[PDB]
Short mmCIF file of C-alpha atoms in Angstrom, two decimals:
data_model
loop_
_atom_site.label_atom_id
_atom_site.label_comp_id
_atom_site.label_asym_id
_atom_site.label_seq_id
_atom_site.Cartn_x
_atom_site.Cartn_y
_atom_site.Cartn_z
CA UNK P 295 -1.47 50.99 -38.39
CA UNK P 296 -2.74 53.45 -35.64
CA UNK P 297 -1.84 51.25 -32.30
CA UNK P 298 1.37 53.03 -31.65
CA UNK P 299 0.16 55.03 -28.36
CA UNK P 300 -1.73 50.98 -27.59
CA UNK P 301 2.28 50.07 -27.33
CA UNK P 302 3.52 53.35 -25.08
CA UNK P 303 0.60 53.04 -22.82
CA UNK P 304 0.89 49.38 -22.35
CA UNK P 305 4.74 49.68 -21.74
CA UNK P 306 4.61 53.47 -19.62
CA UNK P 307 1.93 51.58 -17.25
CA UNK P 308 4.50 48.33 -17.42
CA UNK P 309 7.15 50.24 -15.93
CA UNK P 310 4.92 52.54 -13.80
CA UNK P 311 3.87 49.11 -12.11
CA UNK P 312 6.40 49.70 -8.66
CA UNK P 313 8.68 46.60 -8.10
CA UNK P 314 10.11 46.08 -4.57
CA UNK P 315 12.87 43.50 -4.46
CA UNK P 316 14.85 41.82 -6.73
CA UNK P 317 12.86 39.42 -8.44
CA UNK P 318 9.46 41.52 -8.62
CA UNK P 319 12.20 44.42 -10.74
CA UNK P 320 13.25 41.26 -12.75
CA UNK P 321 9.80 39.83 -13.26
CA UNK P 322 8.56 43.41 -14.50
CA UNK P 323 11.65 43.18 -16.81
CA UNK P 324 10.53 40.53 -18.52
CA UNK P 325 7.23 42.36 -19.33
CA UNK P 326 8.46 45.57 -20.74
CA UNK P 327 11.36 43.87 -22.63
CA UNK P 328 8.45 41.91 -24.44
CA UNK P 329 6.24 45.22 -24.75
CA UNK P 330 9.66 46.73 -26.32
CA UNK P 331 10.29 43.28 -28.28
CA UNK P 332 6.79 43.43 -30.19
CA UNK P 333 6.83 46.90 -30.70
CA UNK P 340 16.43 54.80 -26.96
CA UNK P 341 16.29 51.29 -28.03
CA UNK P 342 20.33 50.98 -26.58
CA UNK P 343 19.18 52.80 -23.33
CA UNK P 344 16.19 50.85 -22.78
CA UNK P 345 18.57 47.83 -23.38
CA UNK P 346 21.14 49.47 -20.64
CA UNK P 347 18.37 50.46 -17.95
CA UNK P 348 17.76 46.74 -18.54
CA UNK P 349 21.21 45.83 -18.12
CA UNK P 350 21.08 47.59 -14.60
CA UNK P 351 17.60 46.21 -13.33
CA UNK P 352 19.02 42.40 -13.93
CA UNK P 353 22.67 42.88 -12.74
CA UNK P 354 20.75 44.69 -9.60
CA UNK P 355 18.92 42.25 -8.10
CA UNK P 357 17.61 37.35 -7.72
CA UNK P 358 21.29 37.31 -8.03
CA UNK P 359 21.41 33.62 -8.82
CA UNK P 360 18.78 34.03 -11.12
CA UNK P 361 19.63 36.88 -13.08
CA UNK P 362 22.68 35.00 -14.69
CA UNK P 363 20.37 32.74 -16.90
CA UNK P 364 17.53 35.37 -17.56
CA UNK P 365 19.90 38.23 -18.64
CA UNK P 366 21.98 36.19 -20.81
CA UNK P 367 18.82 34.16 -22.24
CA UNK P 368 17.99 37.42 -24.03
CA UNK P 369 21.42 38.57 -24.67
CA UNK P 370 22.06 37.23 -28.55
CA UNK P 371 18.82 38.46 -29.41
CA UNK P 372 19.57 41.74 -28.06
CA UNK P 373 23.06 41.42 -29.60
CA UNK P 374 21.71 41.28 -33.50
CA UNK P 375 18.95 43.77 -32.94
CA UNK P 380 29.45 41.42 -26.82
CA UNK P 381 32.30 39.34 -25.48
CA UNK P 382 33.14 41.54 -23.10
CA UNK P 383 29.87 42.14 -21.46
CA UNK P 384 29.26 37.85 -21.51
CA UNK P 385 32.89 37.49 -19.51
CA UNK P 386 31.92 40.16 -16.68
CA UNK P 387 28.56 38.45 -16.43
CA UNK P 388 30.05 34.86 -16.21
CA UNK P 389 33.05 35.30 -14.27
CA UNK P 393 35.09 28.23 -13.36
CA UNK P 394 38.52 26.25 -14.22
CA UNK P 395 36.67 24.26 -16.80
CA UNK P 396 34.73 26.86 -18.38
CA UNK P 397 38.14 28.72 -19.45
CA UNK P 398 39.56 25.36 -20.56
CA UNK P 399 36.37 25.51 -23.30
CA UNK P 400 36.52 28.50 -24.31
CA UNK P 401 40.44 28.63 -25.32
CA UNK P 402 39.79 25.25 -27.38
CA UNK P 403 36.61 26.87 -29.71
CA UNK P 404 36.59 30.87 -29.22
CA UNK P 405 38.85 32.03 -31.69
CA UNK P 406 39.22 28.37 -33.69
CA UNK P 407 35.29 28.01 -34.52
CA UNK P 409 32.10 31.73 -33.61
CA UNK P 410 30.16 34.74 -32.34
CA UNK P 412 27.44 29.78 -31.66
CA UNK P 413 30.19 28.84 -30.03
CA UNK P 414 31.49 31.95 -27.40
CA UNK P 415 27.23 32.45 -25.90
CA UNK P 416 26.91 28.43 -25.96
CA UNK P 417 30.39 28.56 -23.47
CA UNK P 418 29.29 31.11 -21.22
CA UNK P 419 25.73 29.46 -20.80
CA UNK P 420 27.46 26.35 -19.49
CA UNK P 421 29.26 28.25 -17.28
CA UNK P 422 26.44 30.33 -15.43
CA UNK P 423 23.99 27.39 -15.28
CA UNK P 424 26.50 24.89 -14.02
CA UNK P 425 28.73 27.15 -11.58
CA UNK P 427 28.22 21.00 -10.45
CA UNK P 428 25.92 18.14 -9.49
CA UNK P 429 25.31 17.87 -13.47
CA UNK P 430 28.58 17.81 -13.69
CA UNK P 431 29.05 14.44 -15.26
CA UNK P 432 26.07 15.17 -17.82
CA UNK P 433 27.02 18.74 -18.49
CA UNK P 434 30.61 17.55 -19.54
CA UNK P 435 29.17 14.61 -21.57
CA UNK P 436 27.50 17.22 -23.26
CA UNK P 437 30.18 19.50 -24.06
CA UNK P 438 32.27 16.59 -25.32
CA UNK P 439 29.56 15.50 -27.94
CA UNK P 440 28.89 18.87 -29.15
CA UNK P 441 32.79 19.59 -29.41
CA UNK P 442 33.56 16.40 -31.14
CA UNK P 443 30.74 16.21 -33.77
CA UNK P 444 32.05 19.19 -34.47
CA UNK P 450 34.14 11.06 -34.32
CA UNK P 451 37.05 13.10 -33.12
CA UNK P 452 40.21 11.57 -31.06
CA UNK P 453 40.81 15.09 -29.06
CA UNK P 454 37.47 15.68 -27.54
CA UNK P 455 36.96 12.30 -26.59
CA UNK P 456 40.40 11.79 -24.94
CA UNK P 457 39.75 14.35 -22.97
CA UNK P 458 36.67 12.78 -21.76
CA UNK P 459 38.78 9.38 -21.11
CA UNK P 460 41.12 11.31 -19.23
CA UNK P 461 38.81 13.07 -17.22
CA UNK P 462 36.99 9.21 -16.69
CA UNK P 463 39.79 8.21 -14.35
CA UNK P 464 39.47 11.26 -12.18
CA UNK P 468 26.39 5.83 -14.37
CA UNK P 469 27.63 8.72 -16.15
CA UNK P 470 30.85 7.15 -17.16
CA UNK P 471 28.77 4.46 -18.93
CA UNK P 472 27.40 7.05 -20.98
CA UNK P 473 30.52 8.54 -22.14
CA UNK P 474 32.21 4.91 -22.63
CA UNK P 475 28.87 3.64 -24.79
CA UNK P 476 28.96 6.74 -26.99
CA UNK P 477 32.96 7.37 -27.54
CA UNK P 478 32.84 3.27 -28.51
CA UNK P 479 30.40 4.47 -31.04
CA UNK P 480 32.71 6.32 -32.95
CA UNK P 485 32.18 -3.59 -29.79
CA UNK P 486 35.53 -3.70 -30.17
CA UNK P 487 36.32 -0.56 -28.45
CA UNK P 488 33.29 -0.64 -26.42
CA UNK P 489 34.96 -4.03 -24.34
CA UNK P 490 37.91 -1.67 -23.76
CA UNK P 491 35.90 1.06 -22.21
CA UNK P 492 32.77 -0.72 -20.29
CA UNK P 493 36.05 -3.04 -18.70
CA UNK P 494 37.43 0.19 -17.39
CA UNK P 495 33.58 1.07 -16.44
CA UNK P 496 32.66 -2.05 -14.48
CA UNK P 497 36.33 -2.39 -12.64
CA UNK P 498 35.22 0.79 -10.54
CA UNK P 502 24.08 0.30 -7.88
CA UNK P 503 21.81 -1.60 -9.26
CA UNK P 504 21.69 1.13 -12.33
CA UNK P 505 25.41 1.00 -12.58
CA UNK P 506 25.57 -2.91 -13.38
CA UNK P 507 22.32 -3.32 -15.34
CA UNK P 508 24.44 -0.68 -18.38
CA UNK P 509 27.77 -2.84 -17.51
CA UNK P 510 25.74 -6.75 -18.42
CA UNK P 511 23.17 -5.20 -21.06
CA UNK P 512 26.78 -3.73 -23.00
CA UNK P 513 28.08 -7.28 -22.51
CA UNK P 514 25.01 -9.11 -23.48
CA UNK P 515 24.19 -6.90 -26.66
CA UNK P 516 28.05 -7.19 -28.21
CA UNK P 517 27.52 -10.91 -28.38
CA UNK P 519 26.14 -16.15 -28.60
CA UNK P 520 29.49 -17.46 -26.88
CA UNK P 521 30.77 -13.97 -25.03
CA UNK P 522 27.18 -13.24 -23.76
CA UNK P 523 27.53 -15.92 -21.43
CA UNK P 524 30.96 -15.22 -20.31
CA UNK P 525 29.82 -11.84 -19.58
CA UNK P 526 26.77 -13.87 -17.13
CA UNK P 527 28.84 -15.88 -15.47
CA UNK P 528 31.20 -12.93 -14.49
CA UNK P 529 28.30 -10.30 -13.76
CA UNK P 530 25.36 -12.81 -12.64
CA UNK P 531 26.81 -14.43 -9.66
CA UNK P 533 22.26 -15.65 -7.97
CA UNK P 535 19.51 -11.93 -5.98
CA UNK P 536 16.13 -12.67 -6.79
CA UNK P 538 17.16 -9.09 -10.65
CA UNK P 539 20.45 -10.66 -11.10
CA UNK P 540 19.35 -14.15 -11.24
CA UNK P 541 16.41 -13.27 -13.31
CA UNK P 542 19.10 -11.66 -15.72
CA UNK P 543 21.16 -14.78 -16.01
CA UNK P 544 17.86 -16.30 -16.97
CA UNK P 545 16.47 -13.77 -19.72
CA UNK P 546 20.28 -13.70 -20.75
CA UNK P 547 19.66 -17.86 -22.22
CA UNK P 548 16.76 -17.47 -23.74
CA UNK P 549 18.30 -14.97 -26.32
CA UNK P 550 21.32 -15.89 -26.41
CA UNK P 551 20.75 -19.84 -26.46
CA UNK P 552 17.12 -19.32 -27.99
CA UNK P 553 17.92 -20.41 -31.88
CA UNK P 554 20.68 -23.04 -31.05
CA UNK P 559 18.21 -26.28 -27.33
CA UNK P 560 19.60 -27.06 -23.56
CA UNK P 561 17.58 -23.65 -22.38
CA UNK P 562 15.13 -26.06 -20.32
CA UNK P 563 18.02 -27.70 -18.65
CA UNK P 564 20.01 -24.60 -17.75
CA UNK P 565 16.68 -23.16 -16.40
CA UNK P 566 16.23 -25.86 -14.05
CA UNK P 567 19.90 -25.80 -12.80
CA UNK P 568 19.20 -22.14 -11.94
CA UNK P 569 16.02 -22.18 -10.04
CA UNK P 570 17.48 -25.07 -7.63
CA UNK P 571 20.90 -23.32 -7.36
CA UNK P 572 18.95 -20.29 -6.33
CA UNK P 573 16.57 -21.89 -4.15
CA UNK P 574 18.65 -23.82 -2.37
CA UNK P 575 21.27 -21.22 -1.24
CA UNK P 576 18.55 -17.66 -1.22
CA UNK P 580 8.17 -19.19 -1.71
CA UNK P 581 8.63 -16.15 -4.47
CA UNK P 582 8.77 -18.45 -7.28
CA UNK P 583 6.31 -17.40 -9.00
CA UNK P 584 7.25 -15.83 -11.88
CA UNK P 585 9.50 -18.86 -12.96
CA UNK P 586 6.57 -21.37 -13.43
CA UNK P 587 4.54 -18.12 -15.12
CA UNK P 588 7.76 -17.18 -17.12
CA UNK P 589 8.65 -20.91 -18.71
CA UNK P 590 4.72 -21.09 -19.04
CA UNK P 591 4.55 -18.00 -21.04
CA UNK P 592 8.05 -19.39 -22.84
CA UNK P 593 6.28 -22.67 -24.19
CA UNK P 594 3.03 -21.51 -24.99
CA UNK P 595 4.26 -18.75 -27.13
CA UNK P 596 7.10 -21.26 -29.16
CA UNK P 597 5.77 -22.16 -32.53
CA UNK P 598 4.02 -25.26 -33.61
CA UNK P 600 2.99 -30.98 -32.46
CA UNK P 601 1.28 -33.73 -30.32
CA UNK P 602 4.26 -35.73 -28.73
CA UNK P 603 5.72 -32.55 -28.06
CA UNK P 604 3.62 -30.90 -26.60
CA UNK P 605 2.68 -33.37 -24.27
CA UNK P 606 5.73 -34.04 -23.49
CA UNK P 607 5.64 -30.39 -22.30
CA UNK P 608 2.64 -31.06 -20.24
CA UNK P 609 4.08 -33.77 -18.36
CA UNK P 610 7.65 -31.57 -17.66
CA UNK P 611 5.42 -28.88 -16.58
CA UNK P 612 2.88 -30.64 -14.21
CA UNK P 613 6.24 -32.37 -12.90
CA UNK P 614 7.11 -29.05 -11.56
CA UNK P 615 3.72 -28.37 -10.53
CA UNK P 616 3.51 -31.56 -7.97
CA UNK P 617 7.25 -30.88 -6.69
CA UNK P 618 6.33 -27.35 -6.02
CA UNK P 619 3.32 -28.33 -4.70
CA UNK P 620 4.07 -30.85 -2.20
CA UNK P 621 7.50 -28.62 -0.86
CA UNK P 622 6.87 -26.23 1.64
CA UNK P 625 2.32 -22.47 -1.55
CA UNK P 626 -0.82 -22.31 0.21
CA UNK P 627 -0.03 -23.84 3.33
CA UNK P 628 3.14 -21.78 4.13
CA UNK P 629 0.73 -18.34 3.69
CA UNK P 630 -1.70 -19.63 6.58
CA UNK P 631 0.84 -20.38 8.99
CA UNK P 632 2.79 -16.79 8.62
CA UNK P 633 -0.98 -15.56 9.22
CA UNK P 634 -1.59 -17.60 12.43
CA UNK P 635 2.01 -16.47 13.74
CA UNK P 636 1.07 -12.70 12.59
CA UNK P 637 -2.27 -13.27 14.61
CA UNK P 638 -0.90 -14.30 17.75
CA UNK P 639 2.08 -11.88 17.69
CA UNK P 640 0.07 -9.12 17.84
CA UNK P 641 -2.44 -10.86 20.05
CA UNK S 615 -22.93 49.97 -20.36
CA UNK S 616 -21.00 49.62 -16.97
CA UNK S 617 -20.32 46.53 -14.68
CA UNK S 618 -23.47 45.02 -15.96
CA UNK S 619 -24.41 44.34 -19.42
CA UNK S 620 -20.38 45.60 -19.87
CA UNK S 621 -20.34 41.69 -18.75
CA UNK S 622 -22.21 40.56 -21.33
CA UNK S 623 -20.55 41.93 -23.93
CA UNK S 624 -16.76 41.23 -22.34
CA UNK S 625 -16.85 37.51 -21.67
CA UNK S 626 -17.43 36.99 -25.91
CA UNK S 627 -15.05 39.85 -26.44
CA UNK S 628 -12.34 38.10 -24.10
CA UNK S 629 -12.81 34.73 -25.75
CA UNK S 630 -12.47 36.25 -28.92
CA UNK S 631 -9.86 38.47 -28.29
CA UNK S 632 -7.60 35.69 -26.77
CA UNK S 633 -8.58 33.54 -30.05
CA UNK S 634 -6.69 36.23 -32.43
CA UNK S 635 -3.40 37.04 -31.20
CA UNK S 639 2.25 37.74 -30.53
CA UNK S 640 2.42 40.14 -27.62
CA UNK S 641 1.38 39.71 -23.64
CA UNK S 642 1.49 43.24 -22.92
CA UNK S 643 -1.31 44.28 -25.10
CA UNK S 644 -3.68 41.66 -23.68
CA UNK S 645 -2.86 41.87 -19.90
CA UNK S 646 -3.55 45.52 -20.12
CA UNK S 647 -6.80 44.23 -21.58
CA UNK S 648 -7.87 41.58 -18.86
CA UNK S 649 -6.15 45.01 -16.78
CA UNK S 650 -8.98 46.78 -17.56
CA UNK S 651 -11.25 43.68 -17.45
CA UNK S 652 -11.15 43.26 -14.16
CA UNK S 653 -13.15 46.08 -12.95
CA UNK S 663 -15.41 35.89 -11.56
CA UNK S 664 -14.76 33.91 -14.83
CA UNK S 665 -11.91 36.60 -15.97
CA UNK S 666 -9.51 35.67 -13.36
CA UNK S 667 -9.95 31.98 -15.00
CA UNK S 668 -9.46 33.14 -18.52
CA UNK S 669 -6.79 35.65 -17.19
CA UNK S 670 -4.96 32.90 -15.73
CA UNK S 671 -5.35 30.66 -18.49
CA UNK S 672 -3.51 33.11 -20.57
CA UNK S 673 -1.03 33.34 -18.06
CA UNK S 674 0.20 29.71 -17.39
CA UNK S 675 0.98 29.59 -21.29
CA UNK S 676 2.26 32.84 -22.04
CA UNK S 677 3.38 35.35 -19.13
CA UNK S 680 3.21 31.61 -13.98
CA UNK S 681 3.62 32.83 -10.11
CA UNK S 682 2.62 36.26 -11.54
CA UNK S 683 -0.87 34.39 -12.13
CA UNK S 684 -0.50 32.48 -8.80
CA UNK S 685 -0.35 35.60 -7.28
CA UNK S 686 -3.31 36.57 -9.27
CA UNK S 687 -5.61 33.47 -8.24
CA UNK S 688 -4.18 34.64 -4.78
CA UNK S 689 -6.03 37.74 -5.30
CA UNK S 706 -14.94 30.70 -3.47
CA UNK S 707 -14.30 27.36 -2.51
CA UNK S 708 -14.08 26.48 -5.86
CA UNK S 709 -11.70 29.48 -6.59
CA UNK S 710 -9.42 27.75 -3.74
CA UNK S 711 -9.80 24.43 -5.64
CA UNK S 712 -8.36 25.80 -8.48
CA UNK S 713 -5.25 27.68 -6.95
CA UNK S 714 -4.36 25.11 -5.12
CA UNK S 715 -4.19 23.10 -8.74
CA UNK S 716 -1.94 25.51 -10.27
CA UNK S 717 0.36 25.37 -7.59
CA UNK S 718 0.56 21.60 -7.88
CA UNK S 719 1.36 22.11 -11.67
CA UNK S 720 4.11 24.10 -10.45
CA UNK S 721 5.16 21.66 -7.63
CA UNK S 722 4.24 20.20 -4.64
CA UNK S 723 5.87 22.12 -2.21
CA UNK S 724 3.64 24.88 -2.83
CA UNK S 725 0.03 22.78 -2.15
CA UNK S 726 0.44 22.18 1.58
CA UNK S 727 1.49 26.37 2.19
CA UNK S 728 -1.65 27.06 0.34
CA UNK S 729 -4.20 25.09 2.62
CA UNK S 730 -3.24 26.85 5.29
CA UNK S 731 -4.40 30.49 3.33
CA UNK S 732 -7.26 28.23 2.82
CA UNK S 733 -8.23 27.40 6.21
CA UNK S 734 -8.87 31.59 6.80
CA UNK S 740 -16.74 22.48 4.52
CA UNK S 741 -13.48 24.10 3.69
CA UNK S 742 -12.22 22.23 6.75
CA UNK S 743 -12.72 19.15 4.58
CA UNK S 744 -10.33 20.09 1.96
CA UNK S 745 -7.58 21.30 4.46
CA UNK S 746 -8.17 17.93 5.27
CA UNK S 747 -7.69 16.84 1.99
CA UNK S 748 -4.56 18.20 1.40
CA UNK S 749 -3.12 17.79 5.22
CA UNK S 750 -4.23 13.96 4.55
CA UNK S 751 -1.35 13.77 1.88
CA UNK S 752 0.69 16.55 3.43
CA UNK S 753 1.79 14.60 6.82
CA UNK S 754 0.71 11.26 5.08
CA UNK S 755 3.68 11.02 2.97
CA UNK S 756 5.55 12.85 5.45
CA UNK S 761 6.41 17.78 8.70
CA UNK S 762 6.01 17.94 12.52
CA UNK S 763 4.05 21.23 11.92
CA UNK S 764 1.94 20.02 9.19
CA UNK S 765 1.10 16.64 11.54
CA UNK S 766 0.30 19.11 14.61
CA UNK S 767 -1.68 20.94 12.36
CA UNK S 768 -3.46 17.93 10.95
CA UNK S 769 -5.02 17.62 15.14
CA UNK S 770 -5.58 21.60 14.62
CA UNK S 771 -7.93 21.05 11.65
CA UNK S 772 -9.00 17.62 13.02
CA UNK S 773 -9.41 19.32 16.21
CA UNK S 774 -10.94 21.99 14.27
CA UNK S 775 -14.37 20.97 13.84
CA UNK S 779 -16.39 13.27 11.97
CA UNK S 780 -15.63 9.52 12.45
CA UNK S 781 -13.60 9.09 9.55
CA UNK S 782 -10.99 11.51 11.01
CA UNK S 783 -11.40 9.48 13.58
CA UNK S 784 -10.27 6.83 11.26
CA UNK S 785 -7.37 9.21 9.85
CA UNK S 786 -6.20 9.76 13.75
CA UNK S 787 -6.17 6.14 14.18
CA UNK S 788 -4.14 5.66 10.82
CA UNK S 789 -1.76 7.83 12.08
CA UNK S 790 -1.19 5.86 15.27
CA UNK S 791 -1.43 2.79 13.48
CA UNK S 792 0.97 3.41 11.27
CA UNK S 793 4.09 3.88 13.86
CA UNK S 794 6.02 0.63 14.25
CA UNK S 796 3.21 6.70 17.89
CA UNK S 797 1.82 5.83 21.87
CA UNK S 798 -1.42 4.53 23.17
CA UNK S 799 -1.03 7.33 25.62
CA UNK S 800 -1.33 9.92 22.86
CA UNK S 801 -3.87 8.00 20.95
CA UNK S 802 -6.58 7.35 24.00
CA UNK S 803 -5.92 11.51 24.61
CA UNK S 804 -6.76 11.82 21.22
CA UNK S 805 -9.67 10.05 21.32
CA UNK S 806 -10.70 11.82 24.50
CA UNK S 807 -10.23 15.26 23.14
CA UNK S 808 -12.45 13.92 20.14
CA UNK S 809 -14.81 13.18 22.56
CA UNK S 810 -14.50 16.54 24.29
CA UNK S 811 -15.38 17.63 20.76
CA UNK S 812 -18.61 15.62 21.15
CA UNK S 813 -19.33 17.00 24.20
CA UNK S 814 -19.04 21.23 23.42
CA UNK S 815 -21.32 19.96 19.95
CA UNK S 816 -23.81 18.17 22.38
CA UNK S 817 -23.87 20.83 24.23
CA UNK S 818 -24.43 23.12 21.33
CA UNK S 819 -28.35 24.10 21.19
#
């Protein structure tokens, strides 16, 4: 009840506090503003106005306007001086006057934080928060924009709204090892017959992309039979053409042991697995480690 | 009381304090008038979670209490951590070490001539770190055997030391 001098000599010594610069004037304005925000409420709001617009420059754009709709209820005109780049007009002439008091500070934030690198994401942004509000005009302009990573984003989520997804992640792929992994896991989720036409045009074989082709026939040919024979084409393919093979005998291990269950079975999967074993063990591995080491050895000395 | 049993009363009235409240300016005026070891702590704990480099520049103004800055500043980045070692050079010697081991490590040409300063600074396991460094290029044995020599030099002004 009785703290009201604890407020004016808190806030007289927060201002009395001398600020050289541009940031240490900003930084104290964030203190009193709080001190007046607990406790010439338009002129302390003005002599605020002056301290941000007078200093970091950069800085000041986002910390100003951050506490600008709460100083607002307790303003167009003052948001456009602040802000003011091509884009940003373009979004406010589609939801100023057709939407909001929301709508006008959410603009004018995108435009001081952004004028981008985050261009790509910022737009994606603006386009799902426009269109929600499965709308045709905010995502054409996204499509349009497309042909002028963070495509794949817009594609998977205007698809959404995989029929129309093959139309868009097409148009994706036709322009990383991030880039492709969206392009075949698109593919491969859409689906059993078209997930392997979308292997054998991504796949093509690597060490990632041939491990792909191999996790893509497991699911994909895993409730169907022939997964131990495609496997086996693979590896030799790969070998052939490209010593780290050791995650495909620990892989198809894992792949057995873990398949529900007989005798003949699985001893017939004993005998396909030590067949591998002896193969892989008399080709040329133990005995190609010591001879790197002996060559290491008397390269350096 | 004054600065003396004052103390004993503050550090439970700080704790407490801190435990109630909605409003910084209230409370930093407190810790304000505080301040005339353990506060700067509690201070900066408030700080970090409610008012940051305004409490960096308070833990800027004891090896321990270097410990801890140099923490903070991590929290707030890397960059930050190698510029503080050098306000902590002015056994401290082994934790400018410890932060120009990952300083140069991962890197730059200033903070590796400054790792032979503090090397050179006052040790057979920076002996080891020199040699790392060498060993590391794909940098001379030229440089290294002059680096070992000025180690040695080293041995000989702290044999010579009474």
């Amino acid at each position: 009840n009785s703290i009201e001098e604890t407020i004016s000599y808190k806030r007289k010594m927060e201002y009395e506090t001398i600020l050289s610069n541009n940031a240490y004037d900003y930084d104290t304005w964030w203190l009193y503003l709080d001190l007046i925000s607990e406790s010439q409420t338009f002129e302390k709001a003005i002599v605020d106005s002056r301290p941000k617009e007078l200093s970091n420059v950069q800085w000041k754009r986002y910390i100003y306007l951050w506490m600008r709709y709460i100083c607002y209820v307790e303003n167009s005109l003052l948001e456009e001086e602040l802000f003011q780049d091509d884009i940003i007009p373009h979004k406010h002439f589609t939801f100023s006057k057709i939407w909001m008091y929301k709508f006008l500070i959410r603009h004018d934030d995108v435009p001081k934080a952004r004028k981008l690198g985050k261009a790509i994401g910022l737009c994606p942004k603006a386009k799902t928060f426009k269109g929600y509000i499965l709308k045709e005009f905010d995502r054409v302009r996204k499509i349009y924009e497309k042909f002028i990573p963070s495509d794949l984003q817009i594609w998977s989520q205007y698809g959404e709204l995989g029929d129309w997804d093959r139309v868009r992640g097409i148009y994706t792929i036709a322009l990383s090892d991030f880039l492709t992994k969206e392009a075949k896991i698109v593919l491969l989720q859409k689906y059993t017959f078209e997930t392997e036409s979308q292997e054998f045009e991504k796949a093509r074989l690597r060490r990632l992309e041939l491990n792909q082709y191999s996790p893509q026939s497991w699911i994909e040919f895993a409730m169907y039979p022939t997964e131990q024979q495609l496997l086996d084409l693979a590896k030799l393919q790969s070998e052939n053409v490209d010593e780290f093979e050791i995650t495909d005998e620990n892989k198809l291990e894992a792949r057995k042991v873990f398949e529900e269950a007989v005798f003949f079975k699985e001893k017939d999967d004993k005998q396909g697995r030590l067949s591998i074993l002896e193969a892989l063990k008399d080709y040329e591995y133990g005995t190609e480690l010591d001879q790197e080491t002996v060559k290491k050895r008397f390269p350096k000395v | 009381f004054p600065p003396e049993i004052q103390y004993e009363l503050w550090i439970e009235y700080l704790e407490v304090a801190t435990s109630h409240q909605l409003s910084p300016e209230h409370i930093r005026f407190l810790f304000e008038k505080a301040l005339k070891k353990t506060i700067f702590i509690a201070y900066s704990v408030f700080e970090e979670r409610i008012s940051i480099s305004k409490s960096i520049e308070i833990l800027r103004r004891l090896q321990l209490w270097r410990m801890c800055i140099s923490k903070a500043e991590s929290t707030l980045g890397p960059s930050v951590t190698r510029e503080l070692y050098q306000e902590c050079i002015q056994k401290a010697v082994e934790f400018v070490i410890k932060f120009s081991d990952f300083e140069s490590s991962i890197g730059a040409r200033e903070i590796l001539a400054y790792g032979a300063k503090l090397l050179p600074p006052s040790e057979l396991w920076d002996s080891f770190e020199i040699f790392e460094l060498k060993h590391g290029d794909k940098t001379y044995k030229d440089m290294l055997k002059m680096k070992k020599v000025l180690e040695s030099n080293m041995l000989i002004d702290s044999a010579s030391v009474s």
